Amino acid sequence: MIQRTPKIQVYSRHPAENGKSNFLNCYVSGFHPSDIEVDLLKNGERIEKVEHSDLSFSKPWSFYLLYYTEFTPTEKDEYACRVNHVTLSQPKIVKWDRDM
């Protein structure tokens, strides 16, 4: 058996073909086993509608998840990604840096 804790990165992107739109991304990389729970949060509350969740693997034993959706942030809103996995004794919350 092998187990690996995911790396978690949270960031925003505007698609070049429609630059007024903005997407909040959580990229969860390099993990095993593949069982996992991932949410986007707005002011501590789970975002229910997340329109994209894309899972892949490289080696048998290494998985990658991009979990993202359109949003409209304001300066007073806090956003985050919350991940649960067998390697994590409590949920890991990674905040979105409004600059990123």
From Swiss-Prot:
State how changing residue 77 to N affects the protein, per the record.
Answer: In AMYLD6; reduced stability; in contrast to the wild-type, the mutant aggregates into fibrils with classic amyloid-like properties under physiologic solvent conditions
Q: Would you tell me the Gene Ontology cellular component terms?
A: cytosol; early endosome lumen; early endosome membrane; endoplasmic reticulum; endoplasmic reticulum lumen; ER to Golgi transport vesicle membrane; external side of plasma membrane; extracellular exosome
Q: Where in the cell is it found?
A: Secreted; Cell surface
Which GO terms of type biological process are on file?
Answer: amyloid fibril formation; antigen processing and presentation of endogenous peptide antigen via MHC class I; antigen processing and presentation of exogenous peptide antigen via MHC class II; antigen processing and presentation of exogenous protein antigen via MHC class Ib, TAP-dependent; cellular response to iron ion; cellular response to iron(III) ion; cellular response to nicotine; intracellular iron ion homeostasis
Q: Known consequence of changing residue 61 to V?
A: Increases tendency towards amyloid formation
User: Which controlled-vocabulary keywords does the entry list?
Assistant: Amyloid, Amyloidosis, Disease variant, Disulfide bond, Glycation, Glycoprotein, Immunity, Immunoglobulin domain, MHC I, Pyrrolidone carboxylic acid, Secreted, Signal
Give the chief site where it resides.
secreted
* Domain Ig-like C1-type stretches: 6-94
Q: How is it modified after translation?
A: Glycation of Ile-2 is observed in long-term hemodialysis patients.
Q: Which cysteines link up through disulfide bonds?
A: 26-81
Any idea which GO molecular function terms this record carries? identical protein binding; MHC class II protein complex binding; peptide antigen binding; protein homodimerization activity; structural molecule activity
Pyrrolidone carboxylic acid sites (modified residues): 3
Q: Which residues are glycosylated?
A: 2, 20, 42, 49, 59, 92, 95
Recorded disease is: Immunodeficiency 43: A disorder characterized by marked reduction in serum concentrations of immunoglobulins and albumin, and hypoproteinemia due to hypercatabolism. Patients may suffer from recurrent respiratory tract infections and severe skin disease.
The record's similarity note reads: Belongs to the beta-2-microglobulin family.
Assembly description: Heterodimer of an alpha chain and a beta chain. Beta-2-microglobulin is the beta-chain of major histocompatibility complex class I molecules. Polymers of beta 2-microglobulin can be found in tissues from patients on long-term hemodialysis. B2M alone (not in complex with HLA-I) interacts with M.tuberculosis EsxA (ESAT-6) and an EsxA-EsxB (CFP-10) complex; the tripartite complex can be detected in the host endoplasmic reticulum. The B2M-EsxA complex can be detected in patients with pleural tuberculosis and is stable from pH 4.0 to 8.0 and in the presence of 2M NaCl.
Q: What does this protein do?
A: Component of the class I major histocompatibility complex (MHC). Involved in the presentation of peptide antigens to the immune system. Exogenously applied M.tuberculosis EsxA or EsxA-EsxB (or EsxA expressed in host) binds B2M and decreases its export to the cell surface (total protein levels do not change), probably leading to defects in class I antigen presentation.
What is the official name of this protein in its record? Beta-2-microglobulin
Organism name? Homo sapiens
Which taxonomic lineage does the organism of this UniProt entry have?
Eukaryota, Metazoa, Chordata, Craniata, Vertebrata
Query: In terms of the whole protein, what range is present?
Result: 21 to 119 of 119
